[PDB]
Amino acid sequence: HMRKKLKAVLFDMNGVLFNSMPYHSEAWHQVMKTHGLDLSREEAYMHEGRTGASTINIVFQRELGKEATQEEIESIYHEKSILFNSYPEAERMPGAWELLQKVKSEGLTPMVVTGSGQLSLLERLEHNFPGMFHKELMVTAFDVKYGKPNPEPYLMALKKGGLKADEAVVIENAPLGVEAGHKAGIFTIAVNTGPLDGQVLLDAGADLLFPSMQTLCDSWDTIML
Template sequence: MFTQSIQNYLNRHGYTHITLKAVLFDMDGVLFNSMPYHAEAWNTVMTRHGLELSREEAYLHEGRTGAATINIVYNRQYGSDAPQELIDEIYAEKCQIFGSFPEPDPMPGAYELLQDIKAQGITPVLVTGSGQRSLLDRLAHHYPSIFAPERMVTAFDVKYGKPNPEPYLMGLKKAGVQAHEALVVENAPLGVQAGVAAGIFTLGVNTGPMADHVLTDAGANLLFPSMQALHEGWAKLREALAETHL
């Protein structure tokens, strides 16, 4: 399974091999089980402002900047982008609601995987559409000495959120690597689309309520059912990457 997926990727992009130097990680739903809180917060604040965004749909917008999510919903109902003042108000309220929930748990298997990656001399990079200071601050606590500040891409750094490739292209730049020297780890369809659009071999990890095909339809090169499963399959994946050449 691993070998064929890698060969398909190499054929599609015209590369001869993948030399793994960096792994680019999304945060919500990959490092933290925070998406249920995000979905609840978005649904609550949108309803408060007379806008319609279900909890289920919120998962499909994961990875967008807050402003982009608000504009999609507002445009759908009113045919125009939301005023900037309203965007700022809604996003501030959403962050306040999110911050009122219990601290989200780290994803099982994520820290162990990151420890293995660092021990192997591979650079971990954070690429998130989030601007939630509370989650960003928790990285240092739950994932100590893993992500260097200069190896982090957040909503504060990009003009275009996922599914635009800009966040992952910036992640490559911050890691100092090319697309065929990295992997992306994503749990959201928009994030998968962004990784694929950046030309990076993209792993989909289905940690949410979506059907598997949502991630494969978005273009995921490989699919894992959990971060624990990715950790357990990491050694075999690395072997396949090292052995697969065109």
């Protein structure tokens, strides 16, 4: 009985609200390439949600047979940031305004649940989506001990919203994020907005898979009944 119970829709940020993942992927792929290391564009999408350190160490361990130092991690992350910021500013994901407007018109409360602490994207939420969100109904990197795929960010969103899990749905693009929503016990919709096989998102625990935000918006009525 989803129409009766649903109160809130918990949106991830990168790859759901903002179309920033082509730029994060390119920056990771290219920084590693300049260091002579192979991290494909598609693989960078797999690691969406991991810390810079964890991502870097995955590549360092498999290619060089060793961990990166803290000095190597800090410098590669700086390099990645320089590259990312040299690209155009990320636009709103097509379909994101539309789905937000649709759920708002149904009396649902949008929330943001992001692993970002990147204040360059975080500050842009209010003014890219005016009236959609409330600062008190947002979860960012600043609010949590463990990021996705740990369920903590989604469990914290339920707490901030005064919600039970059966009163929310999660909208996620990334396998680690889908895993977090599922492990939080919330009905989780995957939107496959990048180059990954959609099966990866189903295997991470998504209850439904859609190929894009606009497709989900177009199908929202069919879900709810």
